[PDB]
Design a protein around this ligand. Structure first.
Ligand SMILES: CCCCCCCCOCCOCCOCCOCCO
Ligand SMILES: CCCCCCCCOCCOCCOCCOCCO
Ligand SMILES: [Zn+2]
Length: 635
């Protein structure tokens, strides 16, 4: 029961490790799967994509990690783009805060979400072989989900791994929504495949893996353009482009996406003198997606990623431990239209971004108190020159482990993305024109958080209180007057604070009852007044029940009270306001050749009109009542 993302273990009390067997019974998308963990919401976008929203932050203010590596996707661009991780094929998903975030990115203020996978075995399987098989169906979805993974000892110290998943799902049923049985364009198909090969220790393991993922899914709530769009708008010619928006007023939207991945991992256990561990990670990621209407492409998306990170763990110099590393990340990306680059300027013109990053964490241990500090300094070059310095310092006081009090502080700098300073074009799915800013200054943030945790047979609880102070908070500022939005990229200050927590009391070791909840406030302060921050979540209180009876069978009930959101940003609207009731049960079973984990799930029994203010489809109801039956065969 540990975490893997940091070569050196810095553990704060508000760290959460979700089990992989459990994820097999969860939604396919990352954001839907993590929703329900206190402090984490979702930005759904039909059955296709959903991003986690963590402490009101999302995208570039958090970090999704594909087994310590850059996923290489383009989900940071907009929540309609799927995140390239397979949580249903994952070993574990760890949600981490602290100085560790500095190992992977700059500007990560809310949480690091690392998805660890079986791609490259790291260990020799028993009996020479191991793997699992999974199958499930879901009502009103209409989800079919099959999955498998395999590990084979190709000899004495050699292991091959394969794994894959195929999913088909329809437009989802909606309660009371218009006169519709199902919400149009919310269907989703996905396949993933991996082949791996890895060594064994001592000292460690080395290995490579090839992956392939094709996604095909609709764009819910959704011909003339080649001129007027450009050129051009700085400044006020939105006057002249939504005049011919009602001229053509008076295809079928979907995304076809392909992701190809080549990576290498290695990590052995006593590299040479003075060091306890050495860890490498090489990655190449081919990402593409066409945003289409029928068979025609409206936007071409591309993101080539190459990523390298080397981390070594130094000798404990007398109870102070540390891991220092270097990372190289180059990312070639573009976002084009059917229109040539010879007539119009692309939404995102073809660009070359390079990240040179030096990082590390150091922890000192004075018995029942740990102190870990962290740093990151990355330089960027941007062919078509700044530096981000981020630091974090954190203390943990164990009165009696486990009785945890964490105090964590950090200053993080995020360098602006090329999208943010150079965007200039209609993104169809979002029906928004995007404009960049030639002069943004880095996102600087000063963050403080205190977490408290106890888990002691009778009582179990987890609490966290946080504030995030931005001297600079870069945001997509909606602009001057169901047409098409226009956003400019802007700067101000911001003040985010909130709380999240869960507490469980078990009367017997047999039964467990619990209450959970979260709340977050987001404000824009000091504008070039004092308005709310965009797409902030809503408060949520949770009631939880879970009980085994017995040895194999495990029923469970989850009731969430999602309150409305009336603290809204510049052009936002109110969002109710729903009651989520979820039922669940599980079958544990031991036959020959495998453990057989049957499962049955019932979500949204009250059949409520569910809206999420934190999503781009805030006035679009999400899935009504749905039944799920599934099987897993571990072996
Ligand atoms: C036990 C059920 C497992 C089913 C696994 C499905 C098989 C995995 O599919 C992987 C291939 O997915 C399609 C890849 O296509 C990529 C397109 O690249 C061609 C471009 O020239
Ligand atoms: C820190 C909570 C556990 C009990 C602390 C008392 C023991 C020593 O703590 C004093 C200094 O460290 C406290 C935590 O440090 C936070 C780092 O903030 C640095 C901001 O510049
Ligand atoms: Zn898009």
């Amino acid at each position: 029961p540990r975490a893997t993302s940091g070569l050196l273990h810095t553990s704060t009390a508000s760290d959460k490790i979700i089990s992989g067997d459990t994820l097999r019974q969860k939604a396919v998308n990352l954001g839907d799967a993590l929703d329900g963990v206190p402090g984490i919401h979702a930005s759904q976008y039909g059955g296709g994509a959903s991003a986690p929203v963590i402490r009101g932050q999302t995208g570039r203010r958090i970090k999704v990690l594909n087994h310590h590596g850059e996923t290489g996707d383009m989900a940071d661009f907009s929540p309609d783009h799927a995140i390239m991780v397979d949580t249903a094929l994952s070993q574990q998903v760890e949600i981490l805060r602290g100085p560790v975030t500095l190992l992977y990115s700059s500007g990560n203020v809310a949480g690091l979400v690392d998805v660890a996978d079986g791609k490259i075995p790291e260990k020799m399987p028993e009996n020479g072989v191991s793997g699992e098989l999974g199958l499930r169906l879901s009502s009103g979805n209409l989800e079919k989900l099959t999955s498998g993974g395999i590990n084979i000892g190709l000899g004495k110290n050699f292991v091959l791994h394969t794994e894959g998943l195929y999913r088909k799902s329809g437009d989802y049923a909606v309660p009371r929504y218009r006169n519709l049985k199902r919400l149009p364009d919310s269907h989703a198909d996905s396949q993933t495949g991996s082949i791996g090969l890895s060594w064994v220790g001592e000292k460690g393991f080395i290995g490579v893996a090839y992956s392939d993922r094709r996604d095909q899914y609709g764009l819910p709530a959704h011909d003339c353009h080649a001129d007027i769009i450009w050129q051009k708008s700085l400044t006020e010619e939105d006057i002249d482009y939504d005049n011919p928006g009602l001229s053509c007023g008076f295809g079928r939207p979907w995304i076809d996406l392909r992701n190809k991945r080549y990576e290498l991992r290695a990590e052995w256990k006593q590299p040479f003198p003075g060091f306890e561990a050495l860890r490498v990670h090489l990655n190449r990621n081919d990402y593409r997606h066409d945003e289409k209407a029928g068979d025609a492409v409206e936007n071409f998306f591309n993101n080539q990623t190459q990523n390298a990170r080397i981390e070594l763990r130094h000798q404990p110099i007398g109870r102070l431990k540390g891991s220092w590393g270097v990372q190289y990340l180059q990312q070639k990306s573009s976002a084009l239209s059917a229109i040539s680059e010879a007539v119009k300027q692309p939404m995102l013109l073809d660009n070359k971004v390079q990240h040179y990053s030096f990082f590390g964490v150091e922890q000192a241990n004075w018995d029942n108190f740990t102190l870990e500090g962290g740093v990151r300094v990355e330089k960027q070059k941007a062919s078509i020159r700044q530096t981000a310095r981020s630091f974090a310092l954190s203390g943990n006081w164990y009165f009696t482990p486990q009785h945890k009090l964490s105090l964590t502080a950090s200053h993080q700098e995020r360098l602006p993305s090329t999208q943010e300073l150079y965007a200039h074009g209609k993104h169809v799915a979002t029906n928004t024109f995007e404009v960049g800013n030639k002069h943004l200054n880095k996102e600087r943030s000063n963050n403080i958080e205190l977490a408290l945790g106890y888990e002691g047979d009778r009582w179990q609880y987890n609490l966290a209180l946080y504030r995030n102070r931005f001297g600079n908070y870069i945001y997509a500022q909606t602009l001057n007057d169901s047409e098409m939005k226009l956003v400019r990229y802007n700067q101000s200050g911001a003040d985010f604070y909130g709380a999240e927590g869960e507490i469980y009391f078990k009367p017997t070791p047999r039964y467990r009852i619990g209450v959970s909840g979260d709340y977050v406030r987001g404000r824009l302060k000091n504008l070039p007044d004092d308005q709310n921050a965009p797409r902030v979540p809503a408060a949520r209180l949770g009631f939880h029940l879970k009980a085994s009876l017995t040895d194999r069978i495990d029923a469970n009930l989850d009731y969430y009270r999602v309150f409305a959101q009336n603290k809204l940003a510049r052009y936002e609207t109110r969002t109710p306001g729903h009651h989520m009731l979820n039922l669940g049960a599980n079958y544990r079973r031991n036959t020959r050749y495998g453990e057989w984990n049957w499962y049955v799930k019932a979500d949204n029994l009250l059949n409520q009109s569910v809206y999420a203010h934190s999503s781009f489809l805030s006035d679009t109801p999400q899935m009504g009542r749905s039944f799920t039956g599934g099987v897993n065969v571990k072996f």
